[PDB]
Amino acid sequence: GSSCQPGTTYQRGCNTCRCLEDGQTEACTLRLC
């Protein structure tokens, strides 16, 4: 398995994240929480 499952969506605390196609990178929002 990779560090995230590509295409999955979840939260990191108050931020929303998406696992990118390489399963080793994620796109998150920029809230301070």
PDB file of N, CA, C and O in Angstrom:
ATOM      1  N   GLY A   1       0.839  -1.201   0.000  1.00  0.00           N
ATOM      2  CA  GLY A   1       0.000   0.000   0.000  1.00  0.00           C
ATOM      3  C   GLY A   1       0.871   1.245   0.000  1.00  0.00           C
ATOM      4  O   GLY A   1       2.065   1.159   0.354  1.00  0.00           O
ATOM      5  N   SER A   2       0.329   2.376  -0.422  1.00  0.00           N
ATOM      6  CA  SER A   2       1.048   3.673  -0.413  1.00  0.00           C
ATOM      7  C   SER A   2       0.667   4.462   0.851  1.00  0.00           C
ATOM      8  O   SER A   2      -0.104   3.932   1.674  1.00  0.00           O
ATOM      9  N   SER A   3       1.171   5.684   1.017  1.00  0.00           N
ATOM     10  CA  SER A   3       0.991   6.483   2.253  1.00  0.00           C
ATOM     11  C   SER A   3      -0.437   7.033   2.349  1.00  0.00           C
ATOM     12  O   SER A   3      -0.885   7.290   3.494  1.00  0.00           O
ATOM     13  N   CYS A   4      -1.103   7.241   1.210  1.00  0.00           N
ATOM     14  CA  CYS A   4      -2.573   7.408   1.135  1.00  0.00           C
ATOM     15  C   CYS A   4      -3.094   6.639  -0.085  1.00  0.00           C
ATOM     16  O   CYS A   4      -2.337   6.419  -1.053  1.00  0.00           O
ATOM     17  N   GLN A   5      -4.364   6.256  -0.054  1.00  0.00           N
ATOM     18  CA  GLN A   5      -5.067   5.615  -1.189  1.00  0.00           C
ATOM     19  C   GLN A   5      -5.461   6.678  -2.206  1.00  0.00           C
ATOM     20  O   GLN A   5      -6.271   7.545  -1.911  1.00  0.00           O
ATOM     21  N   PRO A   6      -4.889   6.684  -3.429  1.00  0.00           N
ATOM     22  CA  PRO A   6      -5.218   7.710  -4.412  1.00  0.00           C
ATOM     23  C   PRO A   6      -6.731   7.875  -4.616  1.00  0.00           C
ATOM     24  O   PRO A   6      -7.434   6.878  -4.715  1.00  0.00           O
ATOM     25  N   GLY A   7      -7.192   9.132  -4.643  1.00  0.00           N
ATOM     26  CA  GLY A   7      -8.576   9.528  -4.947  1.00  0.00           C
ATOM     27  C   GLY A   7      -9.451   9.596  -3.712  1.00  0.00           C
ATOM     28  O   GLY A   7     -10.544  10.136  -3.832  1.00  0.00           O
ATOM     29  N   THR A   8      -8.990   9.101  -2.566  1.00  0.00           N
ATOM     30  CA  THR A   8      -9.737   9.195  -1.295  1.00  0.00           C
ATOM     31  C   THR A   8      -9.736  10.633  -0.771  1.00  0.00           C
ATOM     32  O   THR A   8      -8.785  11.402  -1.057  1.00  0.00           O
ATOM     33  N   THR A   9     -10.787  10.946  -0.010  1.00  0.00           N
ATOM     34  CA  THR A   9     -11.052  12.268   0.574  1.00  0.00           C
ATOM     35  C   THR A   9     -11.337  12.061   2.061  1.00  0.00           C
ATOM     36  O   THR A   9     -11.922  11.034   2.439  1.00  0.00           O
ATOM     37  N   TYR A  10     -10.841  12.977   2.878  1.00  0.00           N
ATOM     38  CA  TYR A  10     -10.892  12.853   4.353  1.00  0.00           C
ATOM     39  C   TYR A  10     -10.551  14.197   4.964  1.00  0.00           C
ATOM     40  O   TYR A  10     -10.268  15.141   4.222  1.00  0.00           O
ATOM     41  N   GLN A  11     -10.584  14.277   6.289  1.00  0.00           N
ATOM     42  CA  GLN A  11     -10.177  15.496   7.011  1.00  0.00           C
ATOM     43  C   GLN A  11      -8.874  15.252   7.768  1.00  0.00           C
ATOM     44  O   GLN A  11      -8.680  14.149   8.352  1.00  0.00           O
ATOM     45  N   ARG A  12      -8.039  16.280   7.775  1.00  0.00           N
ATOM     46  CA  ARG A  12      -6.883  16.443   8.688  1.00  0.00           C
ATOM     47  C   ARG A  12      -7.275  17.566   9.635  1.00  0.00           C
ATOM     48  O   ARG A  12      -7.243  18.736   9.219  1.00  0.00           O
ATOM     49  N   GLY A  13      -7.777  17.200  10.811  1.00  0.00           N
ATOM     50  CA  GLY A  13      -8.327  18.194  11.740  1.00  0.00           C
ATOM     51  C   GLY A  13      -9.435  18.937  11.038  1.00  0.00           C
ATOM     52  O   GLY A  13     -10.325  18.264  10.508  1.00  0.00           O
ATOM     53  N   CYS A  14      -9.377  20.263  10.973  1.00  0.00           N
ATOM     54  CA  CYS A  14     -10.483  21.077  10.404  1.00  0.00           C
ATOM     55  C   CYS A  14     -10.328  21.233   8.882  1.00  0.00           C
ATOM     56  O   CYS A  14     -11.229  21.840   8.255  1.00  0.00           O
ATOM     57  N   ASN A  15      -9.209  20.768   8.325  1.00  0.00           N
ATOM     58  CA  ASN A  15      -8.909  20.883   6.874  1.00  0.00           C
ATOM     59  C   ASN A  15      -9.417  19.642   6.121  1.00  0.00           C
ATOM     60  O   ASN A  15      -9.461  18.511   6.709  1.00  0.00           O
ATOM     61  N   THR A  16      -9.842  19.848   4.873  1.00  0.00           N
ATOM     62  CA  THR A  16     -10.283  18.769   3.970  1.00  0.00           C
ATOM     63  C   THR A  16      -9.122  18.463   3.029  1.00  0.00           C
ATOM     64  O   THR A  16      -8.475  19.429   2.563  1.00  0.00           O
ATOM     65  N   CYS A  17      -8.891  17.175   2.770  1.00  0.00           N
ATOM     66  CA  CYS A  17      -7.741  16.691   1.972  1.00  0.00           C
ATOM     67  C   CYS A  17      -8.196  15.655   0.952  1.00  0.00           C
ATOM     68  O   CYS A  17      -9.194  14.915   1.208  1.00  0.00           O
ATOM     69  N   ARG A  18      -7.444  15.599  -0.142  1.00  0.00           N
ATOM     70  CA  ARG A  18      -7.610  14.570  -1.183  1.00  0.00           C
ATOM     71  C   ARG A  18      -6.252  13.934  -1.465  1.00  0.00           C
ATOM     72  O   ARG A  18      -5.290  14.682  -1.651  1.00  0.00           O
ATOM     73  N   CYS A  19      -6.199  12.603  -1.486  1.00  0.00           N
ATOM     74  CA  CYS A  19      -4.985  11.822  -1.803  1.00  0.00           C
ATOM     75  C   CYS A  19      -4.775  11.842  -3.318  1.00  0.00           C
ATOM     76  O   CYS A  19      -5.695  11.436  -4.055  1.00  0.00           O
ATOM     77  N   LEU A  20      -3.594  12.264  -3.770  1.00  0.00           N
ATOM     78  CA  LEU A  20      -3.304  12.469  -5.204  1.00  0.00           C
ATOM     79  C   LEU A  20      -2.880  11.124  -5.793  1.00  0.00           C
ATOM     80  O   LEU A  20      -2.787  10.131  -5.042  1.00  0.00           O
ATOM     81  N   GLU A  21      -2.713  11.087  -7.109  1.00  0.00           N
ATOM     82  CA  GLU A  21      -2.638   9.819  -7.886  1.00  0.00           C
ATOM     83  C   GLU A  21      -1.389   9.007  -7.493  1.00  0.00           C
ATOM     84  O   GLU A  21      -1.384   7.830  -7.768  1.00  0.00           O
ATOM     85  N   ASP A  22      -0.357   9.618  -6.902  1.00  0.00           N
ATOM     86  CA  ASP A  22       0.899   8.905  -6.546  1.00  0.00           C
ATOM     87  C   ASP A  22       0.755   8.226  -5.178  1.00  0.00           C
ATOM     88  O   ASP A  22       1.632   7.477  -4.840  1.00  0.00           O
ATOM     89  N   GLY A  23      -0.298   8.510  -4.395  1.00  0.00           N
ATOM     90  CA  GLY A  23      -0.495   7.901  -3.063  1.00  0.00           C
ATOM     91  C   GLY A  23       0.589   8.286  -2.062  1.00  0.00           C
ATOM     92  O   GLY A  23       0.680   7.626  -0.983  1.00  0.00           O
ATOM     93  N   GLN A  24       1.355   9.347  -2.351  1.00  0.00           N
ATOM     94  CA  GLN A  24       2.432   9.872  -1.465  1.00  0.00           C
ATOM     95  C   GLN A  24       2.322  11.403  -1.358  1.00  0.00           C
ATOM     96  O   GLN A  24       3.263  12.033  -0.860  1.00  0.00           O
ATOM     97  N   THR A  25       1.195  11.980  -1.765  1.00  0.00           N
ATOM     98  CA  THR A  25       0.977  13.456  -1.806  1.00  0.00           C
ATOM     99  C   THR A  25      -0.499  13.698  -1.514  1.00  0.00           C
ATOM    100  O   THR A  25      -1.295  12.851  -1.931  1.00  0.00           O
ATOM    101  N   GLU A  26      -0.859  14.793  -0.838  1.00  0.00           N
ATOM    102  CA  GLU A  26      -2.291  15.106  -0.602  1.00  0.00           C
ATOM    103  C   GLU A  26      -2.489  16.613  -0.772  1.00  0.00           C
ATOM    104  O   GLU A  26      -1.551  17.383  -0.488  1.00  0.00           O
ATOM    105  N   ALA A  27      -3.636  16.981  -1.323  1.00  0.00           N
ATOM    106  CA  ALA A  27      -4.106  18.368  -1.502  1.00  0.00           C
ATOM    107  C   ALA A  27      -5.068  18.696  -0.359  1.00  0.00           C
ATOM    108  O   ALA A  27      -6.107  18.020  -0.250  1.00  0.00           O
ATOM    109  N   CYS A  28      -4.706  19.650   0.496  1.00  0.00           N
ATOM    110  CA  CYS A  28      -5.518  20.076   1.655  1.00  0.00           C
ATOM    111  C   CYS A  28      -5.830  21.570   1.556  1.00  0.00           C
ATOM    112  O   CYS A  28      -5.010  22.356   0.995  1.00  0.00           O
ATOM    113  N   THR A  29      -6.950  21.962   2.164  1.00  0.00           N
ATOM    114  CA  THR A  29      -7.245  23.383   2.492  1.00  0.00           C
ATOM    115  C   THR A  29      -6.227  23.916   3.508  1.00  0.00           C
ATOM    116  O   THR A  29      -5.451  23.123   4.103  1.00  0.00           O
ATOM    117  N   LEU A  30      -6.278  25.226   3.715  1.00  0.00           N
ATOM    118  CA  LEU A  30      -5.221  26.029   4.350  1.00  0.00           C
ATOM    119  C   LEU A  30      -5.759  26.682   5.638  1.00  0.00           C
ATOM    120  O   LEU A  30      -5.183  27.684   6.060  1.00  0.00           O
ATOM    121  N   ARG A  31      -6.841  26.175   6.224  1.00  0.00           N
ATOM    122  CA  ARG A  31      -7.377  26.770   7.483  1.00  0.00           C
ATOM    123  C   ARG A  31      -6.357  26.594   8.621  1.00  0.00           C
ATOM    124  O   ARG A  31      -5.672  25.552   8.685  1.00  0.00           O
ATOM    125  N   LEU A  32      -6.284  27.580   9.518  1.00  0.00           N
ATOM    126  CA  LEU A  32      -5.446  27.573  10.747  1.00  0.00           C
ATOM    127  C   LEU A  32      -5.973  26.560  11.776  1.00  0.00           C
ATOM    128  O   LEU A  32      -5.158  26.098  12.587  1.00  0.00           O
ATOM    129  N   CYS A  33      -7.282  26.266  11.790  1.00  0.00           N
ATOM    130  CA  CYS A  33      -7.937  25.410  12.812  1.00  0.00           C
ATOM    131  C   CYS A  33      -7.627  25.972  14.224  1.00  0.00           C
ATOM    132  O   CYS A  33      -7.336  25.312  15.249  1.00  0.00           O
TER     133      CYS A  33
END
